Amino acid sequence: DKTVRWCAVSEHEATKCQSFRDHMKSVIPSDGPSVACVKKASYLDCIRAIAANEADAVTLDAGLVYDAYLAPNNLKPVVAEFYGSKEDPQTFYYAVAVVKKDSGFQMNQLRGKKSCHTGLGRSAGWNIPIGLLYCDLPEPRKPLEKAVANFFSGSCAPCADGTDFPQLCQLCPGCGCSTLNQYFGYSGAFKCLKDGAGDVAFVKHSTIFENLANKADRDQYELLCLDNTRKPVDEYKDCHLAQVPSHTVVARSMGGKEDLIWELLNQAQEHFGKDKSKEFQLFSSPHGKDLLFKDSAHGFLKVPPRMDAKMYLGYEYVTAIRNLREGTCPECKPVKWCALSHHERLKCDEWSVNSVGKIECVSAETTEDCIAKIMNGEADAMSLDGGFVYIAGKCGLVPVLAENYNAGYFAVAVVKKSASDLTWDNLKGKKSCHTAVGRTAGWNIPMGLLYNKINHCRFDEFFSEGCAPGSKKDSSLCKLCMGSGLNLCEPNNKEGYYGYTGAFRCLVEKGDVAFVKHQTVPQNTGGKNPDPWAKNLNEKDYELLCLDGTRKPVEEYANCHLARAPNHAVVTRKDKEACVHKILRQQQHLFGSNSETKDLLFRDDTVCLAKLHDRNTYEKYLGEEYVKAVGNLRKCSTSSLLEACTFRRP
Ligand SMILES: [Ti+4]
Ligand SMILES: [Ti+4]
């Protein structure tokens, strides 16, 4: 059987689940998914059932998505309910802090102000802001209401205990826990700000737009960002306290059956979803409200498979809720560097002990895994090719420092001098060598420029064949690669044509054109590289293709390049930007220009780690032309972390 066991947490839900079961039988072929129904006492029991292999799937709110993720449950998000509309599916809501224009304070300045909350215990209006402010609250932090009552000078916090903590009901005497209190709920809490009662209102991104029809009025309001700046109210996507998913189907991390659940839910929406007019309807029940799914849902979206619960809830939300559950507070710490190999780890380990604690080490198996650990706080920093910076940036990370070599390197197209046919003007049908797909020199620049000329990104149909590590194994752009077994065409060291040098090797041995950097050929010719394939080459036998259509010697790169490359950059979270900026400059003035293999942690031709000033965004660091180009190349991108990040922020 291909059966999905759906977990119900009430008798009304089990009835609906059984009806679900029975109607699906009429629409799904016998080799298709079917439904079984397991009734438990509560969401937490469902979670346990699923983790114990007595059930398979349940739909949860964000706080339970969190519980479900914790050991020993280890469930993950697999399907999202969406709202509003088929054309523009709404999956998340943003908790925001709204304030009046020119009220003159930042998030790190909330102590002593007046606050408006939608209601005690509510997500946007209470658990998130109080969770993120947790360690700012005065001691003792239990009971929590007491500590909040001594942080804000006065508040309106519906359903708080005003009898014990009157300060909390100062702007709404009684703390009425119903719509009889004028300041209850979303519009209530917004109204509390608008009427001048409060200085800040903890609400959802949409609250302001639902209460103020004219832009003229909304301009009188702003949002507090976590980075202690303000932004306009329609910029909540870049200025929110937390991004939060509405309603999320979860499942075991290993053991699924993710695939079956999607095939089930997807077919269910297609026959029984919103507006499908059958006697059974997936998103209502005669038996009561919100049974197994929210009645307001318009359907389901598949959660990208790379996504785990920390990633899906997001860093700010997880921080907030950990604080509320654990309640632990500090009194820069150590920068946790991310290693990608045994050899990278060994350099990092001896860096750690040499830094005397200031640096610690964490490893992952791929760059993307490392980036994900930085997103979620398992790690803090690593250095990355510009192509990975773009991905890190789309995932909410920022560049802090650039690696310097001497404006950065030159991206160049190398060819054999002998074959004097080749020109930039027509490389159609030629054999190409790339460092890896998605890297600056190897891909993003050259194929960026190439995209403008052919108006598609199926480059495996432009070139005859090639080696471009990270391509699909059966692609013509894996035909020239030299890795054996599972390593063929892999973007790592077990593929000998991977990377700057690898791509040049590829040209020497098999290719017609190699996309690399200006100092690749010089460093691998004239006997400098002793390996048999490079030992006897001299740079005079190689030429560069200029945008002109002409060709020039290798050392002539300054007048014969494809474009200026952004340098490789250190990235981190905005919340560690300052600590990473400090420690690394303090570490490089100790261990800089004053690896045991090649290019470990930082490129080997790096002299110093440079300040960025105004370029501390991926867009500003890479430049707009680079970003536009990568945008065009995504149409053919295979990056599953990028797919996860963009699911959350299109
Ligand atoms: Ti709420
Ligand atoms: Ti690079």
XYZ file of C-alpha atoms and ligand atoms in Angstrom:
652
model
C 0.000 0.000 0.000
C 0.821 3.601 -0.599
C -1.237 4.751 2.423
C -0.806 8.142 4.229
C -1.860 8.007 7.894
C -3.364 11.353 8.760
C -3.357 12.407 12.422
C -6.614 13.959 13.834
C -6.743 15.675 17.196
C -10.515 15.650 17.805
C -13.556 13.571 16.989
C -14.830 16.171 14.502
C -11.446 15.999 12.745
C -11.565 12.166 12.617
C -14.999 12.319 10.944
C -13.648 14.693 8.320
C -10.563 12.590 7.885
C -12.735 9.506 7.258
C -14.842 11.364 4.685
C -11.578 12.515 3.133
C -10.479 8.881 3.042
C -13.737 7.676 1.385
C -13.972 10.351 -1.299
C -10.365 9.961 -2.336
C -11.097 6.274 -3.046
C -13.432 7.268 -5.866
C -10.875 9.604 -7.519
C -7.504 7.946 -7.058
C -6.458 4.867 -9.156
C -5.616 1.622 -7.232
C -1.846 2.146 -7.617
C -2.300 5.655 -5.963
C -2.088 7.093 -2.385
C -4.885 6.356 0.053
C -5.765 7.795 3.497
C -5.943 6.238 6.948
C -7.050 8.193 10.049
C -5.446 8.127 13.465
C -7.128 10.022 16.293
C -5.003 11.447 19.082
C -5.736 13.691 22.058
C -3.740 16.725 20.975
C -1.243 18.219 18.566
C 1.629 17.022 20.704
C 0.425 13.472 20.682
C 0.088 13.626 16.952
C 3.682 14.796 16.708
C 4.797 11.868 18.865
C 2.673 9.400 16.843
C 4.265 10.565 13.644
C 7.757 10.387 15.064
C 7.004 6.898 16.428
C 5.793 5.690 13.069
C 2.110 5.339 14.071
C 1.058 8.156 11.810
C 2.387 10.069 8.914
C 1.095 13.613 8.602
C -0.541 16.489 10.471
C -1.087 20.274 9.847
C 0.411 22.604 12.447
C 0.797 26.147 13.546
C 4.244 27.630 13.739
C 4.806 27.056 17.482
C 3.962 23.335 16.974
C 6.142 23.223 13.840
C 8.865 24.224 16.289
C 7.996 21.457 18.824
C 7.788 18.911 16.063
C 11.338 19.710 14.938
C 12.965 19.231 18.345
C 14.619 15.931 19.228
C 13.380 13.333 19.560
C 10.568 14.160 17.155
C 12.602 15.506 14.203
C 9.701 16.234 11.923
C 10.000 18.583 8.940
C 7.636 20.833 6.929
C 6.491 19.185 3.692
C 3.441 20.962 2.478
C 2.219 24.542 3.022
C -1.348 25.779 3.050
C -1.736 28.936 0.988
C -4.177 31.742 1.152
C -5.765 34.564 -0.629
C -5.360 33.567 -4.231
C -4.184 31.009 -6.720
C -2.193 33.648 -8.729
C -0.416 35.145 -5.711
C -0.267 32.420 -3.048
C 0.201 33.748 0.521
C 2.098 31.373 2.642
C 3.623 33.470 5.455
C 2.725 36.456 7.558
C 5.194 39.023 8.892
C 5.132 40.140 12.494
C 6.033 43.858 12.486
C 6.510 46.712 14.960
C 4.661 49.798 13.717
C 5.510 53.259 14.996
C 4.770 56.869 14.126
C 6.952 58.769 11.720
C 9.514 60.841 13.661
C 8.794 59.346 17.125
C 12.615 59.120 17.419
C 13.517 55.651 18.697
C 14.760 52.271 17.468
C 14.097 48.656 18.476
C 17.023 48.779 20.929
C 15.312 51.677 22.587
C 11.927 50.222 23.533
C 12.481 50.142 27.225
C 10.188 52.677 28.946
C 7.928 53.344 25.911
C 4.176 52.651 25.644
C 3.156 49.403 23.805
C 0.104 47.971 22.091
C -0.339 44.243 21.709
C -3.002 42.317 19.838
C -3.343 40.125 22.937
C -1.288 38.220 25.456
C -0.153 34.883 24.091
C -0.726 35.839 20.480
C 2.008 35.375 18.002
C 2.630 38.636 16.305
C 1.389 40.736 19.129
C 3.132 39.021 22.001
C 5.229 35.902 21.664
C 7.456 37.222 18.931
C 8.190 40.750 20.216
C 8.420 39.536 23.824
C 10.458 36.597 22.726
C 13.005 38.802 20.832
C 13.099 41.324 23.717
C 13.379 38.562 26.260
C 16.897 39.223 27.387
C 16.307 42.926 27.618
C 13.600 42.349 30.246
C 14.636 43.080 33.837
C 15.344 40.270 36.304
C 13.733 38.181 37.462
C 12.226 37.325 34.045
C 9.602 34.956 35.612
C 6.683 35.635 35.787
C 6.998 36.938 32.278
C 4.076 39.456 32.607
C 5.832 41.064 35.552
C 9.040 41.473 33.616
C 7.167 43.023 30.638
C 5.238 45.258 33.063
C 8.653 46.546 34.188
C 10.037 47.024 30.682
C 7.393 49.089 28.969
C 6.241 52.049 31.036
C 2.656 51.265 30.278
C 0.849 49.044 27.865
C -2.345 47.667 26.564
C -1.944 43.974 26.576
C -5.406 42.339 26.263
C -5.894 39.332 28.608
C -2.904 40.187 30.758
C -3.356 40.074 34.499
C -4.018 43.765 35.282
C -4.891 42.969 38.893
C -1.322 41.863 39.549
C 0.408 43.981 36.894
C -1.607 47.179 36.282
C 1.023 48.766 34.050
C -0.012 46.320 31.404
C -3.528 47.602 31.240
C -2.766 51.279 31.475
C -3.826 52.078 27.970
C -6.790 49.781 28.096
C -7.987 49.531 31.688
C -9.161 46.019 32.555
C -7.164 44.412 29.750
C -10.511 43.327 28.259
C -9.935 40.075 26.398
C -12.707 40.626 23.794
C -13.795 42.989 21.052
C -15.547 45.071 23.733
C -12.035 46.351 24.414
C -11.460 48.943 21.739
C -7.755 47.981 21.559
C -8.169 44.184 21.223
C -6.854 42.184 18.186
C -5.170 43.526 15.073
C -7.199 46.544 14.363
C -7.399 47.106 18.109
C -3.709 47.214 18.663
C -3.143 49.338 15.562
C -5.872 51.690 16.715
C -4.055 51.997 20.090
C -1.006 53.359 18.193
C -3.023 55.535 15.842
C -5.011 57.176 18.647
C -1.781 58.154 20.369
C -2.261 55.778 23.344
C 0.883 53.840 22.498
C 4.249 54.456 20.831
C 4.498 51.008 19.195
C 2.055 48.433 17.915
C 3.016 44.786 17.512
C 0.836 43.595 14.574
C 1.053 41.841 11.182
C 2.367 43.298 7.928
C -1.186 43.577 6.585
C -2.797 45.297 9.572
C -1.838 48.786 8.464
C -3.161 48.287 4.929
C -6.474 46.933 6.303
C -6.990 50.024 8.482
C -5.680 52.829 6.325
C -6.896 53.036 2.720
C -4.765 56.113 1.706
C -1.030 56.095 1.164
C -1.055 59.719 2.514
C -2.013 58.278 5.948
C 0.396 55.283 5.852
C 3.311 57.664 5.215
C 2.820 58.889 8.777
C 3.865 55.446 10.009
C 7.059 53.399 9.897
C 8.418 50.020 10.974
C 11.189 49.224 13.442
C 13.802 46.950 11.881
C 15.859 44.597 13.964
C 19.036 46.297 12.780
C 17.951 49.419 14.695
C 16.904 51.506 11.680
C 13.337 52.323 10.473
C 11.633 51.665 7.134
C 8.287 52.549 5.489
C 5.305 50.311 6.179
C 5.211 48.810 2.724
C 8.783 47.545 3.154
C 7.906 44.953 5.735
C 9.696 42.290 3.757
C 12.995 43.971 4.676
C 11.875 45.188 8.082
C 9.979 42.739 10.235
C 10.535 41.026 13.574
C 9.714 37.591 12.192
C 8.341 35.794 9.146
C 5.918 33.169 10.138
C 4.195 30.324 8.267
C 0.508 29.994 8.553
C -0.273 26.347 8.512
C 2.138 23.605 7.669
C 1.885 19.902 7.036
C 4.741 18.063 8.787
C 6.353 14.694 8.497
C 9.258 12.572 9.545
C 12.632 13.827 8.440
C 13.779 10.463 7.169
C 11.067 7.978 6.428
C 8.563 10.348 4.848
C 6.536 9.705 3.243
C 6.818 13.243 1.930
C 6.239 12.225 -1.622
C 3.115 10.342 -0.965
C 1.684 13.097 1.173
C 2.129 15.593 -1.632
C 0.668 13.377 -4.295
C -2.305 12.867 -1.941
C -2.894 16.527 -1.032
C -2.311 17.757 -4.488
C -4.859 15.431 -6.011
C -7.232 16.197 -3.182
C -7.121 19.946 -3.977
C -7.590 19.232 -7.638
C -10.890 17.296 -7.074
C -12.099 18.718 -3.708
C -10.328 21.981 -3.101
C -11.609 25.544 -3.165
C -14.595 26.061 -5.622
C -14.665 22.419 -6.836
C -18.368 21.918 -6.018
C -18.443 18.323 -4.900
C -20.460 16.996 -2.041
C -17.091 16.666 -0.261
C -14.978 19.870 0.224
C -11.487 19.750 1.556
C -11.569 23.186 3.199
C -14.815 23.251 5.111
C -16.791 21.022 7.347
C -20.426 20.852 8.434
C -18.995 19.373 11.685
C -17.170 22.627 12.722
C -14.407 25.148 11.907
C -10.761 24.571 10.659
C -10.869 20.712 10.730
C -7.479 19.329 9.377
C -6.727 22.480 7.450
C -7.810 26.091 7.783
C -11.156 26.777 6.211
C -9.714 29.923 4.626
C -6.962 27.961 2.703
C -7.131 28.055 -1.074
C -4.782 25.104 -1.610
C -1.404 23.664 -0.986
C 2.145 24.228 -2.096
C 4.914 21.698 -1.959
C 7.651 22.794 0.526
C 11.025 22.629 -1.246
C 12.791 19.495 -0.130
C 15.994 21.142 1.140
C 13.998 23.091 3.762
C 14.241 22.042 7.416
C 12.134 23.434 10.288
C 14.669 26.109 11.399
C 14.971 27.320 7.892
C 11.203 27.278 7.302
C 10.401 29.159 10.511
C 13.386 31.404 9.999
C 16.119 32.669 12.275
C 14.261 35.547 13.979
C 11.195 33.386 14.820
C 13.272 30.529 16.202
C 15.319 32.940 18.337
C 12.080 34.357 19.791
C 10.543 31.066 20.648
C 13.760 29.432 22.018
C 13.978 32.344 24.452
C 10.467 31.878 25.622
C 10.858 28.147 26.032
C 14.376 27.997 27.467
C 14.799 31.362 29.041
C 18.643 31.557 29.042
C 20.660 34.842 28.877
C 24.340 35.785 28.178
C 26.806 37.889 30.219
C 30.874 38.483 20.523
C 31.788 35.130 21.961
C 33.674 33.046 19.438
C 33.256 33.171 15.720
C 32.186 29.807 14.422
C 33.948 29.334 11.029
C 32.447 26.861 8.528
C 34.725 24.176 6.995
C 33.959 22.160 3.846
C 36.475 19.277 3.991
C 38.902 17.339 6.201
C 41.755 19.567 4.981
C 39.724 22.798 5.521
C 38.803 21.514 8.981
C 42.425 20.816 9.886
C 43.500 24.385 8.977
C 40.532 25.739 10.929
C 41.373 23.578 14.001
C 44.926 24.909 14.210
C 43.569 28.439 13.513
C 41.186 27.921 16.477
C 43.928 26.969 18.965
C 46.165 29.761 17.623
C 43.349 32.317 18.029
C 43.046 31.122 21.641
C 39.331 30.593 21.586
C 38.360 33.576 19.438
C 37.715 31.234 16.496
C 35.861 27.903 16.636
C 35.197 25.307 13.948
C 32.165 23.656 12.496
C 32.067 21.563 9.360
C 29.526 20.644 6.710
C 29.717 18.510 3.587
C 28.880 21.187 1.014
C 28.950 24.977 0.609
C 25.155 25.111 0.701
C 25.074 23.111 3.965
C 27.602 25.589 5.399
C 25.515 28.567 4.266
C 22.408 26.988 5.881
C 24.206 26.609 9.184
C 25.119 30.308 9.002
C 21.461 31.185 8.335
C 20.307 29.255 11.380
C 23.177 30.061 13.801
C 24.978 26.696 13.875
C 27.836 28.635 12.244
C 28.751 32.323 11.844
C 31.068 32.871 8.888
C 32.784 31.510 5.816
C 34.301 32.977 2.623
C 32.504 32.487 -0.712
C 32.814 32.974 -4.453
C 30.540 35.744 -5.664
C 28.063 33.195 -7.017
C 27.600 31.790 -3.495
C 27.406 35.320 -2.050
C 24.349 35.940 -4.273
C 22.774 32.786 -2.868
C 23.752 33.704 0.710
C 22.230 37.147 0.135
C 18.952 35.834 -1.236
C 18.969 33.677 1.926
C 19.271 36.855 4.102
C 23.028 36.847 4.804
C 25.364 39.790 4.182
C 28.971 40.241 3.045
C 31.233 41.806 5.711
C 34.744 41.669 4.224
C 36.255 41.032 0.774
C 39.385 39.069 0.068
C 42.018 41.304 -1.581
C 44.776 40.203 -3.981
C 46.629 43.332 -5.406
C 37.840 46.752 -7.943
C 38.828 43.016 -7.976
C 39.891 40.322 -10.454
C 39.509 40.032 -14.191
C 37.328 37.381 -15.744
C 38.919 36.133 -18.960
C 38.340 33.642 -21.781
C 41.516 31.587 -22.490
C 42.155 29.761 -25.862
C 45.035 27.790 -27.454
C 47.169 30.078 -29.677
C 47.446 27.442 -32.423
C 43.661 27.340 -33.070
C 43.537 30.946 -34.329
C 39.918 30.654 -35.560
C 38.309 31.277 -32.169
C 36.820 34.676 -31.361
C 34.308 35.894 -28.781
C 32.009 36.816 -31.687
C 31.283 33.147 -32.414
C 32.024 30.253 -30.045
C 28.940 28.312 -31.107
C 29.673 24.589 -31.360
C 33.011 24.836 -29.492
C 34.201 22.917 -26.446
C 34.023 24.946 -23.182
C 35.677 24.580 -19.787
C 34.143 26.198 -16.683
C 35.296 26.281 -13.073
C 31.762 25.196 -11.988
C 28.217 26.204 -12.899
C 27.142 29.162 -10.766
C 30.648 30.562 -10.021
C 31.834 34.112 -10.920
C 34.663 33.500 -13.382
C 33.577 30.102 -14.666
C 29.875 30.827 -15.263
C 28.085 33.922 -14.053
C 30.196 36.451 -16.010
C 30.896 34.552 -19.258
C 27.451 32.921 -19.546
C 25.936 36.200 -18.319
C 27.383 37.962 -21.351
C 26.522 35.021 -23.541
C 22.873 35.076 -22.390
C 22.531 38.593 -23.879
C 23.651 37.324 -27.272
C 21.509 34.095 -27.545
C 18.539 34.950 -25.219
C 18.438 31.573 -23.429
C 20.523 29.716 -20.834
C 20.514 26.160 -22.341
C 24.280 26.527 -22.915
C 24.608 22.765 -23.477
C 22.933 23.435 -26.852
C 25.236 26.358 -27.743
C 28.547 24.602 -26.992
C 29.020 21.201 -28.546
C 30.187 19.756 -25.243
C 32.323 20.728 -22.278
C 33.171 20.339 -18.650
C 31.095 22.536 -16.294
C 31.086 20.822 -12.856
C 27.660 20.882 -11.231
C 25.820 20.234 -14.517
C 23.300 17.339 -14.770
C 25.367 14.125 -15.251
C 23.895 13.301 -18.636
C 24.520 16.891 -19.982
C 26.912 17.514 -22.870
C 28.661 19.895 -20.459
C 29.753 16.904 -18.403
C 31.210 15.022 -21.403
C 34.754 16.467 -21.077
C 35.085 16.064 -17.322
C 37.714 13.713 -15.844
C 36.294 12.506 -12.535
C 35.686 8.770 -12.139
C 32.661 6.923 -10.827
C 30.372 9.145 -8.829
C 32.909 11.992 -8.973
C 32.436 12.700 -12.687
C 31.293 16.297 -13.162
C 31.103 16.922 -9.400
C 31.793 20.513 -8.218
C 34.588 19.477 -5.776
C 38.226 18.360 -5.746
C 37.530 14.744 -6.768
C 36.774 16.188 -10.227
C 40.169 17.200 -11.708
C 38.598 19.834 -13.998
C 36.872 21.622 -11.100
C 37.939 25.138 -10.208
C 40.157 27.758 -11.736
C 43.163 25.530 -12.384
C 40.905 22.496 -13.277
C 39.184 24.552 -16.005
C 42.542 25.606 -17.449
C 43.664 21.948 -17.349
C 40.439 21.205 -19.184
C 41.436 23.655 -21.942
C 44.933 22.197 -22.163
C 43.714 18.625 -22.504
C 40.237 18.691 -24.163
C 38.638 22.112 -24.537
C 38.638 25.015 -26.995
C 37.827 27.809 -24.471
C 38.331 28.114 -20.677
C 36.534 30.686 -18.495
C 38.818 31.606 -15.639
C 40.629 34.514 -13.944
C 43.577 36.592 -15.176
C 46.213 34.921 -13.025
C 45.268 31.363 -13.775
C 47.438 30.804 -16.852
C 50.513 32.609 -15.453
C 50.396 30.583 -12.238
C 50.142 27.261 -14.160
C 52.776 27.666 -16.848
C 56.517 28.192 -17.137
C 57.166 25.260 -14.777
C 55.397 26.971 -11.844
C 52.934 24.121 -11.650
C 55.070 20.938 -11.518
C 52.258 18.456 -12.306
C 52.812 16.563 -15.581
C 49.857 18.210 -17.353
C 51.132 21.787 -16.774
C 54.934 21.402 -16.295
C 55.914 21.967 -19.941
C 53.420 24.647 -20.944
C 54.392 28.258 -21.522
C 51.996 31.144 -21.444
C 52.865 32.274 -24.974
C 50.964 29.243 -26.357
C 47.721 30.627 -24.897
C 45.755 33.747 -25.767
C 42.793 35.714 -24.358
C 39.571 36.552 -26.164
C 38.636 40.230 -25.905
C 35.118 41.594 -26.283
C 36.367 43.379 -29.454
C 36.407 40.086 -31.320
C 40.223 40.201 -31.333
C 42.752 38.231 -29.272
C 45.711 39.220 -27.078
C 48.521 37.647 -24.966
C 47.793 36.282 -21.513
C 49.667 39.043 -19.672
C 47.683 41.631 -21.639
C 44.506 40.856 -19.533
C 43.864 44.461 -18.448
C 42.790 45.312 -22.037
C 41.435 41.883 -22.891
C 38.941 40.771 -20.276
C 35.255 39.792 -20.216
C 34.540 41.986 -17.089
C 35.698 42.973 -13.619
C 34.975 40.181 -11.117
C 33.686 40.891 -7.655
C 36.223 39.369 -5.210
C 35.370 36.446 -2.966
C 33.761 37.648 0.286
C 33.220 36.657 3.941
C 29.516 36.403 4.761
C 27.579 36.290 8.011
C 24.217 37.224 9.623
C 23.392 40.943 10.107
C 23.360 40.213 13.889
C 27.103 39.202 13.808
C 28.257 41.675 11.117
C 29.955 43.826 13.736
C 31.600 40.958 15.735
C 32.919 39.282 12.584
C 34.233 42.627 11.238
C 36.118 43.067 14.557
C 37.565 39.627 15.130
C 38.880 38.964 11.632
C 40.747 42.275 11.238
C 42.170 41.576 14.714
C 43.095 37.999 13.495
C 44.636 39.054 10.142
C 46.825 41.780 11.667
C 48.166 38.814 13.693
C 48.294 36.077 11.025
C 48.031 37.913 7.606
C 50.805 39.015 5.166
C 53.485 39.543 7.824
C 47.266 26.463 3.413
C 48.814 22.957 3.306
C 47.046 22.025 0.046
C 45.523 24.903 -1.932
C 42.776 27.512 -1.378
C 41.589 26.394 2.061
C 39.095 28.788 3.789
C 40.390 31.744 1.816
C 41.878 31.893 -1.681
C 45.632 31.463 -1.653
C 46.249 34.773 -3.479
C 44.713 36.779 -0.662
C 46.751 39.475 1.095
C 44.144 41.034 3.402
C 40.409 41.145 4.325
C 38.996 44.523 3.170
C 36.246 46.753 4.693
C 33.141 47.182 2.570
C 31.732 50.556 3.736
C 28.555 51.033 1.661
C 28.681 47.612 -0.090
C 27.332 45.372 2.789
C 24.453 43.994 0.673
C 24.782 41.246 -1.940
C 23.190 43.662 -4.520
C 25.558 46.478 -3.688
C 28.624 44.218 -3.367
C 28.078 42.298 -6.622
C 26.714 45.315 -8.518
C 23.472 45.471 -10.504
C 24.831 44.161 -13.819
C 26.070 40.974 -12.079
C 22.738 40.544 -10.242
C 20.703 41.036 -13.454
C 22.858 38.408 -15.172
C 22.492 35.843 -12.347
C 18.726 36.595 -12.423
C 18.692 35.537 -16.106
C 20.782 32.428 -15.358
C 18.401 31.209 -12.579
C 15.901 30.238 -15.322
C 18.254 27.241 -15.806
C 19.643 26.956 -12.146
C 19.664 23.705 -10.238
C 20.386 25.128 -6.705
C 18.159 23.582 -4.085
C 19.134 25.987 -1.221
C 18.382 28.894 -3.510
C 15.001 27.248 -4.270
C 14.312 27.051 -0.491
C 15.261 30.683 0.208
C 13.306 32.015 -2.758
C 10.199 30.028 -1.636
C 10.277 32.214 1.466
C 11.261 35.497 -0.298
C 10.579 35.463 -4.115
Ti -1.586 37.238 15.810
Ti 35.444 33.085 -7.665
